[PDB]
Design a binder for this molecule. Structure first.
Ligand SMILES: Nc1ncnc2c1ncn2[C@@H]1O[C@H](COP(=O)(O)OP(=O)(O)OP(=O)(O)O)[C@@H](O)[C@H]1O
Ligand SMILES: Nc1ncnc2c1ncn2[C@@H]1O[C@H](COP(=O)(O)OP(=O)(O)OP(=O)(O)O)[C@@H](O)[C@H]1O
Ligand SMILES: Nc1ncnc2c1ncn2[C@@H]1O[C@H](COP(=O)(O)OP(=O)(O)OP(=O)(O)O)[C@@H](O)[C@H]1O
Ligand SMILES: Nc1ncnc2c1ncn2[C@@H]1O[C@H](COP(=O)(O)OP(=O)(O)OP(=O)(O)O)[C@@H](O)[C@H]1O
Ligand SMILES: O=C(O)C[C@H](NC(=O)CP(=O)(O)O)C(=O)O
Ligand SMILES: O=C(O)C[C@H](NC(=O)CP(=O)(O)O)C(=O)O
Ligand SMILES: O=C(O)C[C@H](NC(=O)CP(=O)(O)O)C(=O)O
Ligand SMILES: [Mg+2]
Ligand SMILES: [Mg+2]
Ligand SMILES: [Zn+2]
Ligand SMILES: [Zn+2]
Lengths: 150, 310, 152, 310, 310
């Protein structure tokens, strides 16, 4: 027959219930694949809670509450499982962070952040049912949908 | 220490109603009773990376009326940033080993905020950062509005012209919104409208504001007519249809205006205020400019002198 | 037997791209736009390998690499293995054949090449060599290492 | 049809020894007895996107000597590509609906090849594309070498100066390498050496070539001394140390020359050939230029006429 | 004499339906069987005071295909008007003593009309005068429409883009309006709408026209989709919001097109027609350009020959 098998991880993180099409986006942003650690990704998996979902497993790697919170912009209904000795030892859900640093680029062409050795930074807030991001430097505010990443 | 001692002064959005009132109270006192040696032995940097007449000269004048010395530049072309490719970060990193405060104007939004991240314990005072903020303009404006209306609350305030790129009206609207019951009329071309982050802030505070297409609609009601220049140096090429003042105030436009109403303008004006307005008792933009001395003296005192003055 | 919630199903029909060198797998996912599908996908990055120590691995259901993608794969990951699968079985297995031309995806490193300014598809004569592999631009006629070019 | 009828003439790489000999034989005949109506009723575009004296004027004269009409431009600045943003692609797309052949010089490598993808059945002749190829220069060069030396085989040929950016020597080396037993001497600054893909081609054909740091080093044995100009409009700023001629030929350097040796230069020269060379029997760059007429007539005649009887 | 013998060709407004049909019939004949000596012993001036690729090169090619000689310039910078202050009036006054006809393009409206007041018996052909008229473009346009549609009546014609500054659509609309039952769809930004004097002419002839904000709105019913470039060298600074193509045609927009529909564009295009359109059967802008040869030959032949027998 065959030797097909996916060996459960001893220690690390399992990001579950990622909405369809978002899994690859998370990998791209947070540079999750820039590591020598074993990673396992399932995309378009069947789900009871969601119908379709993506799933990211990363060995020997953990996310702080803030790192988990960054995920709220993209996958708010995701579950982040911390794993030690093959056991789910922690389950967290992303709560909207107060700031998003480093990964996004201010869309204002005249912002000082583009010309100088600083890291991007936006304050995060709910506006209607949109998420508004206010650049720490130029203080202009944008819909998160138009604020690109690096 | 007073609440503002050694504080960076970057954005009105970082200040409270109490901070603003503290500047104004200090201004009254120093105008009443000048303390010509309050800042003796201070050396302050005056660093202007874009053009200025009023802000730079009033700031430097304020520094000398208080006894401080002044170093700096009125353009960047002959700094090492201008000729040798130095970053602004490195410029601030060295200048902040020389002086007791840095006053800076810069053409990019966020410049003054960035400077604070490299100035260590040296306070940065934002003399204007692109189309973002102009907090010391707001201080002198508040002083002037108080001087002529007797209060900062329950006022009818029209702002006219380029509201999108007016760093002056961004700061001033945020500041007046910290006071109770002020009402706003925004008279701007569609393309240069007041930005959404300012309007959202007003809505959150339940402040009333509306858009008008003419000065005449609001003239009867207004206590403060705040005229602005089109910020042509900030305009995207797509916005070049808006270079000429869309609204021109003339003396005849002032018939049905309240006797308490003042016309303000952060200056320079192009044609948005005709010279015939100058002689009318409503004109107060030159008096407004002169109050920059008291506001800026006040701010330097609060930032560089530990105790409240008397 | 509790663990039966942890074992990915084999594919009935589809592709398994194996022996992808480390750090290449994620690159292939973007370049081939593979994740832009509703089909089930599983990916292993930095997996142990007898043959090559560490490897990446991509499996896609009901889906096969296009001739474009197969040709480009020969360049990106020459030692990678393409497995075609029907009825749960490996019916076809091969290292992708090097093509002679690669169009559209590469960028000529000659900055004064006309191909940058103009609405044409890039094109490079591909010839296998000793240590690397040579790409000669159809337009400027200059020849480069795929190393210099694949640093697009 | 002759082998060159309706063919694009883009790169010496695409031509065989027989193709080159055909042009040379055809040129010898047209020089011997002219065919003034050979291209009657042809209109040919001369499109120069960078400077030229010899190539454009000899090409246009050639067209007229064969009875063709000429349209085009010597500068792109007043075409719609120069003023309205038009691509080269579209430019060729329309011009190829007007004319029977297109002669083009362009500052980017590949431009002529690209034109062939838009010109349909209209043949494109490459008058120079960046630092890549210059096939018609090579045609006249071969013709001149053949005339003076009696052969294109077993020659000793030195090429001096900017070999990196010299499209002239890229094409000439390739062509001479299609003949037997030629030996090459490359005299160039390191930063401007003959490129490796040329040397590789010489190697895989087992052709002897060597590098030298002086002309006197090889003066006594060369049949053809091919001088070149530093292509300063092509140099990277990092290569400005090489702007001046590194090798300057003077009449006195020719004391040990073979009597039959000729000095060639595709022209223009700056200082790499001193004016005192001009009077010597070895100077042949002006005669070479004059031969552009017969090579270019020959090329046009073979491309636009199915069969020639001469 | 034919109706157009020795006539100036300045504005479509001065021509009748019969005049236009004469050029079209004459062009069809010259395309069918060429007359290479028809303008033998004529010398014609080609004077371009602004950029051109298609108009100048097709005009000059046309002259050569008919056996005429050509003198002139593609830039005014090296004429005595460009360097010595000479008026256009004097320029035409002397050139009209040399040549048998004058083809002129100029950046000011009226320039060609003015030339006719100084050229005496020498006919002036307007190759474009500012944003006013472009009669020879219209001649080739009509010819192309006639070829592809079989008629110049009862067409559905959409014109897209910059209709305000498009001298091409000013002339084309006027000409099509001399035929019966055509219907027009104008798809343009407000700031660049078809001018009122054109619409007025349509009204007083009872011709149906309407305005639309999209191409898909009319795709299913148009016989001719005439795309245009934004004339950015004509825009007032106040109109720079319109510099980018507002309407971009792509292959996928043609899914519901009439099978016989053709996409035209006087060229050059920037982005208003995507390159994926080129392969579709509806793309006809290059064939259109190619027809400039037959329309311009026809015009020259009718103006310079008393009677034609073909
Ligand atoms: N040792 C392990 N190695 C790899 N994956 C694991 C391991 N342990 C758990 N997982 C995965 O992490 C997630 C853990 O969730 P859990 O074990 O609670 O299942 P669950 O009850 O379905 O979770 P939820 O209630 O959040 O849907 C599952 O997606 C499971 O596949
Ligand atoms: N390491 C892995 N790589 C790829 N796919 C996997 C991996 N582990 C499990 N899966 C697949 O993920 C799918 C969903 O499993 P999971 O345990 O998340 O479902 P669930 O918990 O019952 O549903 P819900 O997502 O609602 O909690 C299964 O079909 C399984 O085959
Ligand atoms: N039905 C299937 N579904 C998913 N994956 C499969 C399926 N069949 C095979 N594979 C995977 O595809 C690859 C097929 O290789 P194969 O079965 O020949 O093993 P192998 O002998 O190790 O191959 P190789 O010699 O190339 O390393 C294996 O990595 C296997 O895990
Ligand atoms: N679907 C999968 N997802 C993630 N990891 C996998 C999957 N299938 C196999 N692996 C991992 O990859 C490793 C090697 O897989 P496999 O047995 O297919 O290759 P191999 O033949 O052992 O190695 P190689 O062929 O490279 O010498 C295994 O140890 C397993 O942990
Ligand atoms: O420039 C304006 O129109 C308003 C305002 N003006 C000033 O600060 C006065 P000045 O530029 O002379 O210092 C500004 O934002 O710079
Ligand atoms: O420019 C050179 O030095 C060599 C060569 N020269 C010529 O073709 C002569 P011209 O530029 O006058 O047509 C060239 O590549 O253009
Ligand atoms: O320029 C245009 O967009 C349309 C029109 N175009 C042409 O005549 C083609 P060309 O400018 O190449 O002669 C014109 O009015 O000049
Ligand atoms: Mg679950
Ligand atoms: Mg294996
Ligand atoms: Zn910003
Ligand atoms: Zn290239």
């Amino acid at each position: 027959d065959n030797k097909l098998q996916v060996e459960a991880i001893k220690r690390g993180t399992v990001i579950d219930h990622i909405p369809a099409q978002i899994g690859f986006k998370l990998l791209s942003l947070f540079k999750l694949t820039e590591t020598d650690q074993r990673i396992t990704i399932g995309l378009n998996l069947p789900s009871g809670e969601m119908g379709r979902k993506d799933l990211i497993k990363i060995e020997n790697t953990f996310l702080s509450e803030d790192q988990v919170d960054q995920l709220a912009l993209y996958a708010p209904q995701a579950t982040v499982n911390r794993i030690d000795n093959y056991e789910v030892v922690g389950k967290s859900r992303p709560s909207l962070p107060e700031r998003i640093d480093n990964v996004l680029v201010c869309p204002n062409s005249n912002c000082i952040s583009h010309a100088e050795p600083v890291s991007s930074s936006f304050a995060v807030r709910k506006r209607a049912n949109d998420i508004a991001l206010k650049c720490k430097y130029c203080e202009k505010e944008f819909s998160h949908n138009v604020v690109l990443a690096n | 220490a007073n609440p503002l001692y050694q504080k960076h002064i970057i954005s009105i959005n970082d200040l409270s109603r109490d901070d603003l009132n503290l500047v104004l109270a200090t201004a009254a006192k120093l105008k009443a009773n000048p303390q010509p040696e309050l800042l003796k032995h201070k050396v302050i940097a005056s660093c202007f990376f874009e053009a200025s007449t009023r802000t730079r000269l009033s700031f430097e004048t304020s520094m000398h009326r208080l006894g401080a010395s002044v170093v700096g530049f009125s353009d960047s072309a002959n700094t090492s940033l201008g000729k040798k490719g130095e970053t602004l970060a490195d410029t601030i990193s060295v200048i902040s080993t020389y002086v007791d405060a840095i006053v800076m104007r810069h053409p990019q939004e966020g410049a003054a905020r960035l400077a604070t991240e490299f100035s260590g314990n040296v306070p940065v005072l934002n003399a204007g950062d692109g189309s973002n903020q102009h907090p010391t303009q707001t201080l002198l404006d508040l002083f002037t509005i108080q001087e002529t209306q007797g209060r900062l609350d329950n006022l009818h305030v029209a702002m006219v012209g380029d509201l999108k790129y007016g760093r002056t009206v961004h700061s001033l609207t945020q500041a007046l919104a910290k006071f109770d019951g002020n009402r706003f009329y925004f008279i701007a071309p569609d393309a240069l409208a007041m930005p959404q982050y300012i309007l959202d802030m007003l809505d959150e505070k339940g402040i009333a504001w509306s858009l008008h297409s003419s000065i005449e609609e609001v003239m009867a009601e207004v206590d403060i007519l705040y005229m602005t220049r089109v910020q042509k140096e900030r305009l995207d090429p797509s916005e070049y249809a808006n270079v000429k003042a869309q609204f021109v105030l003339r003396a005849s436009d002032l018939h049905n205006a309240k006797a308490n109403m003042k016309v303000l303008h952060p200056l320079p004006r192009v044609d948005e205020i005709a010279t015939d307005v100058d002689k009318t008792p409503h004109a107060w933009y030159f008096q407004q400019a002169g109050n920059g001395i008291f506001a800026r003296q006040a701010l330097l005192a609060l930032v560089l002198n530990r105790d409240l003055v008397l």
